[PDB]
């Protein structure tokens, strides 16, 4: 390991001499306290190292040691139910060994070296192993953690430990080359983990919300963006996604949040219950926490650490949902870092490579054939918070250029107590056409046409708002008040969804299909009756309005009988009416 | 339709690629068979001469200790030094006087840098 | 409204360009100062 | 055939590194950077002097050190190996196959920058191209040898129009009056800064109707190194020029989302610390875009042609 | 029909095998040429 | 002890000293000249050849032959104690009230360590500021960061003094509570003038509020490094008190615009390339290190609340200072120039104001169960009234409906009685009573956002309940 | 050199109604025609080349498309000179430097064109000089000054841009030649803001 001494100190920038042989971007420990930093420039016998924490109190001549490796994360058992900072430091153990403040130069391990794990070998001596293969399994709560050979390691198995209790440090497999394979390994956060092949977005990512799953769907392995208006219930939607979506593991990244905002999420999650198992939701999530007063480098590396952990869990063959909160704060941290490097700004002070970094983060999502031959996927939902809702921000413009969906959350709908408060006019999705065959094969062959009809009815309702604004609604004739009322029925009974209710919090695809079928059939018969000469007020008090309005709260298994009963009642009622 | 002719074309391309890589494997086997036969001293001395001609101010000559006795003759001729190294075989390397430049003349490197031009030449020979 | 909005957008570009030019000038003069100190003292 | 190594690395910062004793590296040459682990990276000589030569690394510089890194000359001028068997293939924008098939055998190696056409050698474009779209064909007809861009927006379907034009483009020799024999036609498709979803869409669109049998694809993903986005249109146009002016093909070149090309150019220019232009874009952007767009045309005494349809999205309309 | 695809596949395999055999009828001369070129 | 005399360069605020490798980065030093006068300085760069020192105040008498430099402290530290209550300091901890220096219990670095996010807990208790438009509509919660946005000519200093004079907790509204929980105020002024200094001193001394306050006062002609250091010392004292003696402290930062200007000047003096609009690139990080020192800690009974005050440079909320402040704080309170010119004090404008943590500090078991609905109804009614006030200028009063006229009267009554409280001190119950009296002007059933229970319980009181002595 | 400058008193007939009537230009005068892309600068200049009453026309294609020079080279030999009745190309001189040709040569091309125009003036003819775009010449100056690392004026242009433009435009005028005859040079320059 290259070792040297401090030559010059000027704020966060430190120049060390005698560092010949040190490599670019290697993590170095500066001073007697061992403050960590990166090498950003090499010149002759000297290296420019920039420290994460404050450098106040350092003296010229103190040792500088290079670890020889770039920024990396430890990947292995023990990450679930954990809470980490932007450089993977376990906050709970830091609190336990330090108190309420984060002192400088504290050293803890990301994975506990003391806990015992139930090793179960799945290989024998004489086997040939290549990167991504499974050496064995370890139980981690409800998950069977698969110990994977690192992607770059190949060889032949020499000896394998028997089943028993071991820490993450005992070598479980030894190769003929002498290499020792442990329960964990390290990986650079800025290099994507390899796969065999990337698959097409053929299957949907079912979130459990009717509006998101029907009108603006996202495929598994896709990407989505959402704004962050205050009072719009963004956090409720995010935790509903965590609870109900079909992902196996959830990774939550908070990079630049306010202190109290991080307190809210750190207090709320330990109380949520996973509906699949009935136990805590925290057993299947990983939390990354960063407040605004934490070091800039951690705030910048938080999203890369999160996506690397998500990629690891994907490589184990799971389906992972990654939520990155306030990527605008990450962009602000990137802008600050670029400013300290004295780079020429592009547009609104941001560095010219902002779009490149955003693309490098977002392109890691996707459904792949892992090196072990299994299937896994990572889905990214990243929040964007413009300064005042300005969609012309460089961050928003770059984000919308690469994402496949955009769920425009609106404060106005929340003001009128409409939940979820998602504006269906500004939102869009690019996954409907590719996902259509899955709908035809798995829910109904008519489903896409029904969805298109519902969207057309919504657009027609939106088209009349000028007349409704200029003139009171009741002055309009029967056939247009009919579309106004059917749009109101749609808004109240299909788009709206109460996340706090015991059965309405989650809605399957076939339930939504049945509701749409009922609504469209009622609309068709209502238009026919209107042409038959009935008044609109006669239709407005038919028996089936309560039946349609209460379709939301029926159970999932009870729903088919209720649906066919209501379909019968629709035809029955309109025959009684003239 | 074209859905059949595409299969013919892709099969032809795969076969041609397999033929060329088999030719490459035979070529590399033939090249690595060279040190076992008495043709090696002349070709290695010629490669050392070429390396020394590439560096007008060359200081020292570096190769594996097996080739050092044969390169002693060139060392006495041009006046450069010689030293042992477990370097890549089928070639000889040299070190410049300043120590900042260096040339390498391994035969496997020559194959690697010449195959791109030899491929189109041998393709006509194969067909 | 569109005309005033376009005028605002144009003024923003002008001010941004002037700021960028000033940043470039400061960078050049700092480079000259550093070169002078580090090569001639 | 032998190779020369340079080990006088004296300074590394960002995307630049200085080599001390390399006086025989020519300006604009392409080099290989090898570190201690054996990984090799590309680079280009952007400035050479007696004290040192300046090399811009084609990618990130993690892992390089002043003790073990070495530099070797690859070729004096950047070149591409071209052949007529490139039809029906897919490449990554730097010239390497990504469709799973063996590499081609280069019939010739050509510089990617090309040379300017002599204005005396040109001739006036005089024949049209049928794109199958009524508005273009009737009111804004495309002519062999023209460069006619498409000004798109942030949510408009530029990709669909590009794919449709690629599928439907034809030459219509019967209408020419003389009833001439059928003439070869080809499409060179270059995508810059593309995402995985659009890549799959384009692949399926080209595979669905068999149009891929007459097409050459250069596909550059958004997560690729930023240098590859600079070189993709140049390789596409090199292939187009070779086909058109050595085999009398009527080639159509479609460059998708030149806005990403402009972003990459701005990134590179800001890396080299040049004087900026109107919105941070390099001042020489006009000349750089001209060196791409003016490679199209028709040449006197030759029957082939090159036609370009750039596609770009106007920011904020 | 699928029969046309099968016929095309059989023709492709036959032509590929013919090309492979024709190439095997020249391999040693090509190898000798390559060694003639690569050697100094 | 040991003195360094190898001075080789003096220009502006900087001087270079040779062979000073023993000086740690950031250390505080004393500079002495031929006449014996001593000045302070900070080490901003250390090298093997020379060290760079930024001098406090001015370098008028210095020379290269007789000047010497000696070390004072490796890290800037402040001595703290419970004796600091009732004292005044100049911004570097030097007393200025004429009383003897305190004997410190401990000396703490002024740059504070970050709070561990897992150690924080959720704020759930409110502070009674005594101002209706703050207590009712923009409630301040213990542990919140709620800034005030003011103009150039607006009376923000008077509002700050009034809040410091009136603010208190209300333990008797939370269950049974505890009658005694210590409360303290830390007041920090940056770049103020002599007039404002005298105003603050008189206001604090004339009412006994000094006995429960600590003052850090920095004048406009004082050195800028002192202006930089002042808020950190104030927050160090606040943190020490709150998290070692279980006090509930309220911290008021008088002008953050002056702090930002001082930061810009210090950055420019060190030859750093500025970011957007000439401000330092790391301005967001510095502001975050200042603001994020407030909060409530699990297992601790103390708390820290921050009320930054900053004047918008040209009434532009797009300016970098307010824009970056918005990202870090939970809402804002905005003063209105129109209300000020109309003669209303305090000129707080409810419509642009917002408190993002209000929903947690109000309800049952704290304040009163009708609080949130009453605030929402007041907001909506005031908006309707101010719109009808513009409409009536064109169409006339007679063309309005009865409800529009009633809204128009409600807006005027609201401005005259709810906002224009003057120097009067109002409890939360008094403010709620006034709000209900003003809501009684509107007809029942128009109160859409209030449940029928509270309407039955409280609606129907006449304005004379406060009109008797407004 | 010349003997004496003269006050222009005769029109430069362009053949276009709006320019000849509303905004005339004299024989020794100068004119600028700015406009965005697609406005009609090149068509106007080609119409001036085809139809004006000047004895000799010098066309300077500084930094523009090659097809625009090819069109001239192809069409002009077939057209008829408006006054002498011969081929139109027999009175025209073309200096071409397209966009993808070397940048530094634009400045050389401008001066070559103006010097040839001055020579033909010295022979006693009336010459019209068409400059395709001076903005490309300004861009070349900006690039060269960027290599020299000079401190730039507004928008990165060198501070001496205005002096260069004034020196170029001052060569026009109706003069008494050193040989005692009378000649003139008319300069029309397009700008591409
Ligand atoms: N899906 C939902 N179903 C039912 N009620 C909801 C839903 N989403 C939000 N709400 C209600 O509306 C409120 C939204 O306002 P609130 O300010 O609390 O949102 P939030 O989730 O904290 O998000 P934000 O940070 O955007 O304000 C929630 O507190 C809750 O009472
Ligand atoms: N006087 C005209 N009569 C008819 N059509 C004209 C006339 N002027 C311009 N046009 C039309 O406008 C088109 C663009 O004109 P032109 O080529 O002169 O543009 P320009 O101003 O030189 O632009 P650029 O900056 O692209 O060189 C011509 O191709 C022609 O179709
Ligand atoms: Mg033109």
Numbering used by the authors:
A (entry chain B): 1 to 578
B (entry chain J): 61 to 187
C (entry chain G): 169 to 209
D (entry chain E): 3 to 319
E (entry chain I): 81 to 120
F (entry chain D): 5 to 474
G (entry chain C): 194 to 386
The authors write:
Cryo-grids were prepared using a reaction mixture of nucleotide-free V/A-ATPase, containing the regenerating system and ATP at a saturating concentration of 6 mM. The reaction mixture was incubated for 120 s at 25 °C and then loaded onto a holey grid, followed by flash freezing. We determined three rotational states followed by focused refinement using a V1EG mask for each state. In these structures, nucleotide densities have been identified in the three catalytic sites. Hereafter, we refer to the structures obtained at ATP saturating conditions as V3nuc. The V3nuc structure, obtained under ATP saturation conditions shows all three catalytic sites occupied by ATP or the products of hydrolysis (ADP + Pi). Since the hydrolyzed Pi is clearly visible in the ABclosed of V3nuc, it is assumed that V3nuc is the structure before dissociation of Pi from the catalytic site in ABclosed. In the catalytic site of ABsemi of V3nuc, the density of each nucleotide phosphate atom was easily identifiable, indicating that the ATP molecule occupies the catalytic site in ABsemi. The V3nuc structure is formed by binding of ATP to the ABopen of V2nuc but the binding of ATP itself does not cause structural transitions between AB dimers associated with the 120° step of the DF shaft. In the V3nuc structure, where nucleotides are bound to all three AB dimers, three distinct but associated catalytic events occur at the three AB dimers simultaneously and these events are coupled to the first 120° rotation step of the DF shaft.
